Subunit: 634 residues, 2 copies
């Protein structure tokens, strides 16, 4: 007995509308007989064959196949001893015949020098073109004959052919039916071929017949006649599914080269845009001591030395000569009317009696009457509608006043240290005295460019299996569903490391970013975050089913992981509850650890550093068990 | 007459290794005869039928069908007068039988009350289940029968069928072949049916035959059997494809509600995390005037009033009671050893004779000597390894010294105004005197949340057509390429406006981003900017065939948008070449216009405002013609 089923009960639909496809289904396939499962279009015929190879659970029946229940250690449904053929052509369209016969070649442990020893024989038996032609340009009949040879070469001992002769001319159909009757001559193989052409089914030995949810009769075709009628009929698996993932990238070279040009482009833009201070902003200076001529011109022939003359046009040219452009107006009421409509960013005003009011405010002290302490002031109106240019504009006018004040003392009377606020900031312990925005955000972006590029790579990898077919007919071949996932991790970790190192080269070597700490541990962490990123793209593909429903889910996680992590604002700005929640995240703790390597210089031994590795290894495992659990569930 | 081909030529293979599928191909279909195109498996049979309906173009030949070549206004190829059944079942599996009959119903201009009668008649004729059962839930023989009732209901005058009776039992295949005879009794319609089931092909009366790229015979069967052998001779279209787009968003309500929760979640996080001043951060204060006890106690009593005693403790409690914690150490060499290992963010130092050296500095004035200069300084070491917290700490110790200085002159007898540098900043013309980082990035993130969400929506739309079929046999039913794209804009612009207004409500009304200029124009710009985003996602789908290149291309074009538009840094730091290029972009000219509406208050009439509308309406047209040119001709 090859297959034997007792008391089979299956049905789809809700309890309010039962279907009742199968009712009893008591049959027995004697070993060595070409069992033929004929029937009527509409009954449960494929749903029985699909219940034999363990594709659908039988819902409280008894099924015994080649030793035991399907999918159990005592039977042989998944393995090299069971042939198969689906109703629809489940073949990958981008493979040549010589490649699709090797993908299934060494899944069943066939030697590479033995597959092609019979590939030519199979191509000669059933007519087929040259073996280098991809199976997408093949006709509709030469695509069925390939599927009949893919799952016949390994010489199984139980064939589950369903509709194998649909779409070929009668000569080829006779040739196909003249083969199942030759290999079965000895008691070694069984066939369960089912077809809808009953005339050709006379060659079988144990023709079955289904009428209503149960087998009607199972007798020889010439015994069926004269009783019911009168006349006529009334390492292998890993290596196999790893040269298919690698071959996929090579098939469309040109877009695979694009993914290697993304990190270099995304890093060049960041270094060339963010951080550099503005250098092309203007001002409206209306100094009322020099006669107003032209628009971009005014005399500045002040006195150079201990003689204090024309102090107004000495504070000018004492500020930055490159980040501020000077423009002159004759009327204070007109300068404010120039910044108002957007022709400048500010407007100064030096009163007519400025030098006298300032030379009498330093020599005289603590006796400054309000009249004297009202004309020595440099009135400035700022267009503070940008909150980032006005901040450096008002940080430059008064910082440049320090040089103006120190120049007075250091040239005439005393040591250039009186004009200093008593608070002295010494030398910073870790950083520099001139912080830059491009250095606070750089360590948090390198860990983010890598994370998102890895997510986009492995975002549809687990979802294209249904796209190309070849999946549900490879489950029968014994492919463990934890074995496809492993081959995706290996086949993409090679290409992820190729662009992770591209970010580091173009951000540390070409563009200067300090690396006071150890360089070995930075690389380990920056690929521990990429691998965590690509494992996050598997919990999306497994959960999602529709292709369009998974693009906008990973893409919808761009901003929330760019704000919740500390990238552009310190993590201490959030309230006391969001800050606590935003610590158990994949990226919020790696930026803090990497910031303590590039700038401070701490090694791994420091407690604040190894938390990044500890809190990113956990997420790798967490994103893997969930992805595996969903895959194993269905 | 009905169809005639003269001197047809077509080859598939590359140059110097041709295929030569067709050589001459001279045939003629009569006025009302059931032409049957039989032949061997491997010749050009489907590629001839697929060249009649205009799916493939001949190389050098003349094809003349229903009075003119395909694609000419005089010929009815892409019309309601041509039936068409493909070799493979090109049906959408998510539609019920009634829905998929109505979708093809009113493409040809069929009244909704007239389709139902034909639907019931066809369901009665060829056995089929209840009309509200999904096609994907049907069997393999009840899915072919549905496809037979779609290419037959509108009553065409030229039926084209290739293998319409495969996978169905003979008792019903005879019924199918018994229908093409009844409807063709008069000289109204023609049938061009190709089958490999030669036994039942004797019912026709113009059987053809192909051997190698040429028609062999075109005679009647019972004449063929007696010639050289004995036996075995070997508004509707828009309405149609718009209740199908509106329907696929109703079968996944679980995820359709998710896309309405992204904008509220992505805006709540931005306003709750970015902008707030850090509040929890410590200091190491080692004041050498009060005895050191505990570690959170310093006995701060400083003789409140005009009397000048314990000035060190007067400066303390004058910084901030909220944003700075205080921790006290007894040794200057130990405070630096606390900030060094991360237990603080700074370390002050008040010398044991601080008050005496400060009460004498404001009296001697210009007569100060270096002995008393370097004894009244609040030495502070700062951990500037964050560059964002150190800035607000360096800007708080000295800004709070202004209060300490004014607390002295304004205490006993003086006017609290001789403590300011001669630079006075007056009142800002447009902004406020206390700029915030959150108010600078908010007008420019709203334009980015909308842009990115629209791209995610309409980026898999044009590549999902090939997934569910219904496109090979939609081009035949007079569906021009223009109106497929148009119906993808109306069906998503409704759902994009539903989340564009969600961003505005949750950013202006609830969280409180000010808007001085005009609320009418902001909504127009933020809607007409999102529409530019959704049109950009169409150019991604038009030029990308494989779906795996859509997630990677769309998600990989995000960082080059934040870093190249002025979202987080004003566009003046880039070099001259990059700054000039960046203005000709969809977003960099629109954030500037929106920033001049919320902050300045300018209306549209200002010339710096309508450039945003003008420079993003162009991109809508530019992204549409390219998305249409590729879609029309490939
Ligand atoms: N896209 C293609 N590119 C190249 N060659 C092709 C392509 N499609 C088909 N061919 C080849 O050109 C010929 C066209 O075959 P065609 O589709 O007409 O066969 P058919 O009569 O439908 O086949 P069958 O009855 O065996 O299913 C065949 O030799 C086929 O191998
Ligand atoms: N996924 C499904 N959900 C519900 N009912 C289904 C499903 N698949 C098939 N059926 C129904 O189960 C019954 C048996 O289908 P089955 O696939 O066994 O038919 P079959 O013998 O292969 O058909 P045929 O030869 O006519 O193509 C049919 O009534 C079919 O409509
Ligand atoms: Mg079947
Ligand atoms: Mg065909």
């Amino acid at each position: 007995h090859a297959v034997c089923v007792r008391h089979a009960f299956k049905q789809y639909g809700s309890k309010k509308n039962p279907n009742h496809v199968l009712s009893d289904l008591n049959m027995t396939v004697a070993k060595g007989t070409i069992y033929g499962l004929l029937g009527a279009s509409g009954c449960g015929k494929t749903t029985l064959l699909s219940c034999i190879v363990g594709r659908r659970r039988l819902n409280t029946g008894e099924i015994w196949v080649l030793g035991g229940k399907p999918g159990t250690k005592g039977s042989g449904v998944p393995g090299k001893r069971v042939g198969y053929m689906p109703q629809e052509i489940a073949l990958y369209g981008e493979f040549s015949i010589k490649e699709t016969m090797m993908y299934f070649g060494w899944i069943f442990g066939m030697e590479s020098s033995e597959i092609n020893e019979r590939l030519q024989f199979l191509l000669n038996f059933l007519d087929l073109p040259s073996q280098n032609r991809l199976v997408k340009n093949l006709s509709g009949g030469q695509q069925r004959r390939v599927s009949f040879a893919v799952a016949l070469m390994h010489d199984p001992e139980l064939l589950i052919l369903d509709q194998p002769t649909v779409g070929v001319d009668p000569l080829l159909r006779q040739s196909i039916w003249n083969h199942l009757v030759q290999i079965t001559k000895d008691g070694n193989k069984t066939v369960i071929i089912t077809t809808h052409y009953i005339e050709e089914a006379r060659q079988a030995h144990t023709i079955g017949l289904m009428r209503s949810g149960k087998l009607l009769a199972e007798e020889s075709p010439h015994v069926l006649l004269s009783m019911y009628g009168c006349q006529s009929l009334e390492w292998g698996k890993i290596k196999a599914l790893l040269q298919k993932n690698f071959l996929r990238m090579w098939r469309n070279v040109g877009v695979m080269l694009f993914i290697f040009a993304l990190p270099v482009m995304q890093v060049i833009l960041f270094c060339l845009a963010i951080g550099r201070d503005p250098t092309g902003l203007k001002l409206a200076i209306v100094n009322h001591e020099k006669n107003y001529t032209n628009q971009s011109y005014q005399e500045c022939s002040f006195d150079y030395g201990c003689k204090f003359s024309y102090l107004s046009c000495r504070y000018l040219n004492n500020l930055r000569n490159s980040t501020i452009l000077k423009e002159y107006y004759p009327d204070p009421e007109s300068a404010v009317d120039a910044v108002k409509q957007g022709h400048a960013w500010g407007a100064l005003y030096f009163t007519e009696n400025f030098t006298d009011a300032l030379v009498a405010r330093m020599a005289l002290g603590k006796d400054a009457d309000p009249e004297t302490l009202d004309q020595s002031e440099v009135r400035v109106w700022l267009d503070m509608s940008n909150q980032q240019i006005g901040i450096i504009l008002q940080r430059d006018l008064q910082l440049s006043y320090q040089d103006f004040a120190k120049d007075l003392l250091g040239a005439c009377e005393q040591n250039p240290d009186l004009a200093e606020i008593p608070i002295s900031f010494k030398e910073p312990i870790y950083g520099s005295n001139k912080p830059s925005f491009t250095d606070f955000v750089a360590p948090g972006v390198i860990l983010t460019i890598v994370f998102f590029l890895a997510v986009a790579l492995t975002s549809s990898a687990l979802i294209i299996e249904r796209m190309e077919g070849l999946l549900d007919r490879s489950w029968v071949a014994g492919v463990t569903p934890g074995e496809i996932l492993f081959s995706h991790v290996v086949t993409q970790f090679v290409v992820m490391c190729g662009q992770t190192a591209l970010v580091l080269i173009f951000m540390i070597l070409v563009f200067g970013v300090q690396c006071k700490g150890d360089i070995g541990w930075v690389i380990v962490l920056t690929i521990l975050q990429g691998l965590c990123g690509m494992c996050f793209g598997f919990v999306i593909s497994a959960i999602c089913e529709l292709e369009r429903n998974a693009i906008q889910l990973a893409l919808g996680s761009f901003y929330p992981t760019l704000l919740l992590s500390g990238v552009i604002w310190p993590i201490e700005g959030m309230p006391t509850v969001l800050r606590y929640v935003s610590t158990f995240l994949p990226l919020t703790l790696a930026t803090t650890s990497l910031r303590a390597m590039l700038t401070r210089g701490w090694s791994i031994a420091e407690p604040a550093v190894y938390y990044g590795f500890l809190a990113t290894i956990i997420w790798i495992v967490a994103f893997l068990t969930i992805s595996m659990l969903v895959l194993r569930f269905k």
